[PDB]
Amino acid sequence: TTALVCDNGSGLVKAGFAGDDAPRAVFPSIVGRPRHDSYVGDEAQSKRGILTLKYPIEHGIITNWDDMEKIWHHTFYNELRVAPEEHPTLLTEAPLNPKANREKMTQIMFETFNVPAMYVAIQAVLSLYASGRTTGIVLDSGDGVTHNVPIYEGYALPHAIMRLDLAGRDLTDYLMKILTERGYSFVTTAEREIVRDIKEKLCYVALDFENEMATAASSSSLEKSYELPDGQVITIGNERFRCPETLFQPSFIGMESAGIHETTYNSIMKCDIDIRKDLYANNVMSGGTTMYPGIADRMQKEITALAPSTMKIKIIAPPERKYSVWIGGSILASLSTFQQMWITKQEYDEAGPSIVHRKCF
Amino acid sequence: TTALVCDNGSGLVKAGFAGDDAPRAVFPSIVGRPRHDSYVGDEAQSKRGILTLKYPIEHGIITNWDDMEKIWHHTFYNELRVAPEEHPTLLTEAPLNPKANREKMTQIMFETFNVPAMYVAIQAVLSLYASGRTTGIVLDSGDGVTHNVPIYEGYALPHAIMRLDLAGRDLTDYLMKILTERGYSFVTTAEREIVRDIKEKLCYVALDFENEMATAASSSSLEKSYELPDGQVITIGNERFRCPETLFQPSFIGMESAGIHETTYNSIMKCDIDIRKDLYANNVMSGGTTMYPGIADRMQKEITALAPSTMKIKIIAPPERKYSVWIGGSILASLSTFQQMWITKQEYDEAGPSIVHRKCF
Ligand SMILES: Nc1ncnc2c1ncn2[C@@H]1O[C@H](COP(=O)(O)OP(=O)(O)OP(=O)(O)O)[C@@H](O)[C@H]1O
Ligand SMILES: Nc1ncnc2c1ncn2[C@@H]1O[C@H](COP(=O)(O)OP(=O)(O)OP(=O)(O)O)[C@@H](O)[C@H]1O
Ligand SMILES: C/C1=C/C(=O)O[C@@H]2C[C@@H](CC[C@H](C)/C=C\C=C\CC1)O[C@@](O)([C@@H]1CSC(=O)N1)C2
Ligand SMILES: C/C1=C/C(=O)O[C@@H]2C[C@@H](CC[C@H](C)/C=C\C=C\CC1)O[C@@](O)([C@@H]1CSC(=O)N1)C2
Ligand SMILES: [Mg+2]
Ligand SMILES: [Mg+2]
Numbered sequence: 001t002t003a004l005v006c007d008n009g010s011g012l013v014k015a016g017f018a019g020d021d022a023p024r025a026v027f028p029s030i031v032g033r034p035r036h037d038s039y040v041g042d043e044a045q046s047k048r049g050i051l052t053l054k055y056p057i058e059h060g061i062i063t064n065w066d067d068m069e070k071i072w073h074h075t076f077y078n079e080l081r082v083a084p085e086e087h088p089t090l091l092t093e094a095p096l097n098p099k100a101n102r103e104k105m106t107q108i109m110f111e112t113f114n115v116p117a118m119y120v121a122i123q124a125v126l127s128l129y130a131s132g133r134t135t136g137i138v139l140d141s142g143d144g145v146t147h148n149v150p151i152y153e154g155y156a157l158p159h160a161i162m163r164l165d166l167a168g169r170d171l172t173d174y175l176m177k178i179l180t181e182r183g184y185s186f187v188t189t190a191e192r193e194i195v196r197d198i199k200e201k202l203c204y205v206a207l208d209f210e211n212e213m214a215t216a217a218s219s220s221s222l223e224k225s226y227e228l229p230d231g232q233v234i235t236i237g238n239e240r241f242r243c244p245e246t247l248f249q250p251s252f253i254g255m256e257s258a259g260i261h262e263t264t265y266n267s268i269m270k271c272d273i274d275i276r277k278d279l280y281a282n283n284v285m286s287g288g289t290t291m292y293p294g295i296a297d298r299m300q301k302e303i304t305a306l307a308p309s310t311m312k313i314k315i316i317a318p319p320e321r322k323y324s325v326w327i328g329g330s331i332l333a334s335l336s337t338f339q340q341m342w343i344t345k346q347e348y349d350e351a352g353p354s355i356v357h358r359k360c361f
Numbered sequence: 362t363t364a365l366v367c368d369n370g371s372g373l374v375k376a377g378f379a380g381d382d383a384p385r386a387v388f389p390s391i392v393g394r395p396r397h398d399s400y401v402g403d404e405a406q407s408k409r410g411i412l413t414l415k416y417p418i419e420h421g422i423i424t425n426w427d428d429m430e431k432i433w434h435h436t437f438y439n440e441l442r443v444a445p446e447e448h449p450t451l452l453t454e455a456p457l458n459p460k461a462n463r464e465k466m467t468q469i470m471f472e473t474f475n476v477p478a479m480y481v482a483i484q485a486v487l488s489l490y491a492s493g494r495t496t497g498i499v500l501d502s503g504d505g506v507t508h509n510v511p512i513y514e515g516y517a518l519p520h521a522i523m524r525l526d527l528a529g530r531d532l533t534d535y536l537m538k539i540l541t542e543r544g545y546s547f548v549t550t551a552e553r554e555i556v557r558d559i560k561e562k563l564c565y566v567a568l569d570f571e572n573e574m575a576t577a578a579s580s581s582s583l584e585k586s587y588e589l590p591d592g593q594v595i596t597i598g599n600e601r602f603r604c605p606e607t608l609f610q611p612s613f614i615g616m617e618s619a620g621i622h623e624t625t626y627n628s629i630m631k632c633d634i635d636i637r638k639d640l641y642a643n644n645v646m647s648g649g650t651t652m653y654p655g656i657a658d659r660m661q662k663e664i665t666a667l668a669p670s671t672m673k674i675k676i677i678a679p680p681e682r683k684y685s686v687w688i689g690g691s692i693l694a695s696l697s698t699f700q701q702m703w704i705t706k707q708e709y710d711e712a713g714p715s716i717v718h719r720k721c722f
Binding site: 099153155347350351352353354355357358359360 | 711714716721
């Protein structure tokens with residue numbers, strides 16, 4: 001009976017059961033086939049020297065499905081200890097995800113895994129119920145993708161979906177750079193991983209850059225040392241809010257401009273006025289990234305700038321937003337009105353891929 | 362730039378233009394040829410000799426597709442004299458018609474019609490819309506069939522739906538029976554048509570199959586004598602209501618099938634006791650057969666005498682409650698909002714024919 005939720009994030013894969021208050025398995029979204037079978041997850045990584053590791057998925061989109069399945073499989077078997085062709089199933093996707101993909105995706109569940117039933121939901125949209133909403137503009141900033149998702153009655157709006165190709169890993173990478181720069185090494189991939197945690201444990205969203213930037217060099221009372229695994233420990237200036245600053249500065253690492261709140265306006269201002277109003281006081285926002293301090297109040301103002309005078313702008317940062325996408329699934333999967341919403345072998349059996357094509361979740 | 366409305370009525374077809382507060386089209390959904398290329402419409406009518414014309418749409422469901430193909434064709438052209446690949450399209454589906462049938466006329470349409478965009482809905486709902494409601498039981502007492510469709514704010518209650526195969530052209534093959542007793546003709550379709558003409562003319566579902574049926578040996582006051590083509594006038598007694606009434610008596614044949622009102626009830630009953638009141642206080646007579654006057658105050662009895670005392674019950678039965686289906690749909694087909702629903706040429710050449718099973722409204 002128990003269905004299964006799996007947010008196949010670009011770098012992370014959240015997956016547990018239905019209704020389950022939280023995805024049980026949350027491991028690395030990559031695989032490694034022989035250097036000269038494959039392996040995946042922590043294991044996959046646990047074998048650097050002799051493995052050719054790659055993210056089966058790129059920008060929250062599947063590319064080498066081999067590894068992909070080489071995951072899926074590991075995910076029930078080597079992972080969830082459960083029978084595929086034995087449980088209702090839910091998969092997440094990215095906004096404006098290419099038809100044949102979303103279709104190919106299904107091809108495999110019944111085909112190879114003979115999964116009984118299944119469905120597909122936009123990572124976004126998931127996060128939206130994960131908030132108790134069926135309409136709003138979301139901000140699922142994972143490890144490597146970014147979209148502004150105009151939703152209504154729980155049904156999205158393509159033509160108005162701004163994607164800001166950039167995220168999670170960017171900054172992490174970003175950082176290292178502005179550090180190897182401030183006297184510090186780290187150019188091996190293994191070092192990058194160090195930085196991230198660092199990037200997470202410390203980095204924050206400066207309510208104000210300039211006001212903050214000076215202070216950095218002016219005061220200090222805004223930084224700390226780091227238990228570098230090596231043993232040696234170290235601290236960082238401006239950076240703490242410079243890296244996460246890149247978020248509003250798609251001109252911090254080269255890039256193309258625009259940027260977040262903008263691409264947001266540049267997402268809302270592509271949405272039939274009638275909605276706009278109500279699209280303004282509901283900013284949800286999932287994915288590792290969004291997990292920042294002050295990131296909150298920071299945006300609010302950002303927009304109010306563009307945000308016309310007397311308009312109430314409300315950003316909602318779900319304390320658990322890191323999994324909302326998954327958490328959403330957990331729910332919808334585990335629901336009633338959703339029964340008929342599934343896809344069936346009997347159905348997939350008779351039709352083909354195009355069968356999947358339906359309405360909002 | 363304009364869309365279309367087509368009521369594929371079991372044994373009839375009404376059509377016109379979205380908005381157009383009349384459907385300009387209404388005709389015989391029959392196809393026929395020489396006993397030994399083809400003849401559709403009332404053209405087929407005048408051929409009882411050379412033609413052995415068979416009707417399509419089988420109880421509301423298609424059957425000789427290749428055949429039905431002509432029906433439609435006969436439309437835009439001979440009839441409306443209009444263009445297909447140039448107007449959006451809407452089609453009434455059959456209340457709980459298989460998914461197989463679906464993608465058929467859907468692909469067929471486009472494929473062998475190159476249509477802009479097409480959508481399809483159950484007949485039973487439009488009729489509902491067609492009355493200012495979106496909830497409450499409806500009854501497509503049309504020609505070939507008569508269904509009981511509970512509706513909930515736009516959703517039908519599959520599980521909770523009833524389908525009775527008696528209707529219009531049902532009570533007819535019969536009428537031609539009851540009469541062979543006072544001794545008369547009416548055996549050939551030639552003669553069979555005359556029947557319905559009479560039915561719809563005189564026939565009525567009054568009230569008592571008793572105190573009413575008591576007036577019989579009684580006061581030979583109120584009866585009549587229709588002047589048939591054969592010039593010769595004819596007499597009729599209780600048959601003026603022995604035929605229609607049969608709906609509250611299947612045993613008139615042997616249908617060990619449920620009495621209408623009862624099925625309706627049955628339907629309402631199989632519904633969520635919560636919503637049951639609304640769908641109870643609401644009941645529509647979508648169907649030509651649903652015309653036998655005085656049928657108004659009638660049904661009330663049939664049911665409240667089963668409907669829990671503390672209530673109230675009304676059976677919305679408008680005048681054009683003979684096209685409500687077509688009418689109601691000729692609305693959906695008129696609204697900027699409707700686009701979000703349509704299935705355009707490109708919304709098919711990419712998503713296979715199964716992209717039509719899924720709606721919002
Ligand atoms: N507390 C945090 N603050 C900021 N960034 C974080 C935090 N925790 C994780 N991240 C970053 O967000 C990225 C992860 O997100 P998520 O779990 O959002 O990715 P996915 O869903 O795996 O990928 P994507 O959403 O890009 O398709 C991580 O790889 C990491 O770089
Ligand atoms: N005034 C009337 N009184 C009685 N019966 C009528 C009247 N007008 C039409 N009918 C009968 O009702 C039948 C028609 O209904 P409708 O137009 O409801 O049929 P469809 O569209 O062919 O079928 P369905 O509605 O069951 O899908 C006719 O074929 C006819 O025999
Ligand atoms: C705590 C953690 C979080 C995470 O989300 O990791 C994902 C997955 C990870 C895979 C590569 C590493 C070596 C192998 C195992 C990692 C396990 C846990 C790492 O590559 C990221 O780190 C990239 C690199 S730099 C960044 O910003 N994203 C995102
Ligand atoms: C006024 C009318 C109404 C109608 O509803 O016709 C429909 C369609 C009709 C098709 C066959 C005939 C020869 C051809 C053209 C008829 C045109 C108009 C007839 O066969 C019915 O008559 C049958 C016969 S007896 C009955 O109960 N249904 C129902
Ligand atoms: Mg994500
Ligand atoms: Mg009809």
